[PDB]
């Protein structure tokens, strides 16, 4: 989940 969201940055 972390990576899936972190892509924003
Ligand atoms: C949520 O974005 C997320 C993405 C990816 C993973 C995850 C957990 C474990 C592995 C792993 O063991 O890969 C070995 C090649 C990969 N990706 N967790 C949560
Ligand atoms: N929020 N993160 C990003 O926008 C982001 C853009 C590009 C990359 C990235 C990572 C690795 C490579 C490579 N060729 O190994 C290229 N671009 N990460 C994050
Ligand atoms: C549940 C999280 Cl969002 C996830 C699923 C599949 C691939 C990467 C992340
Ligand atoms: C992105 C993944 Cl499917 C997720 C959504 C909402 C709560 C927890 C995980």
Q: How far is 9 from 5, CA to CA, in rounded Å?
A: 9
Which residue bears the tokens 């990576």?
3
Exp. method: X-ray
Q: Ligand 1 pocket, 1 CB below 6 A?
A: yes
Distance in Å, CA 7 to ligand 3 centroid: 12
SS (H, E, C) 1-9: CHHHHHCCC
Q: Ligand 3 pocket, 1 CB below 6 A?
A: yes
Distance in Å, CA 6 to ligand 3 centroid: 12
Task: Report the Cα–Cα distance between both ends of the chain, in Å, rounded.
Answer: 14
Please tell me what resolution, in angstroms, this structure has.
0.9
């Amino acid at each position: 989940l972390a990576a899936a969201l972190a892509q924003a940055l």
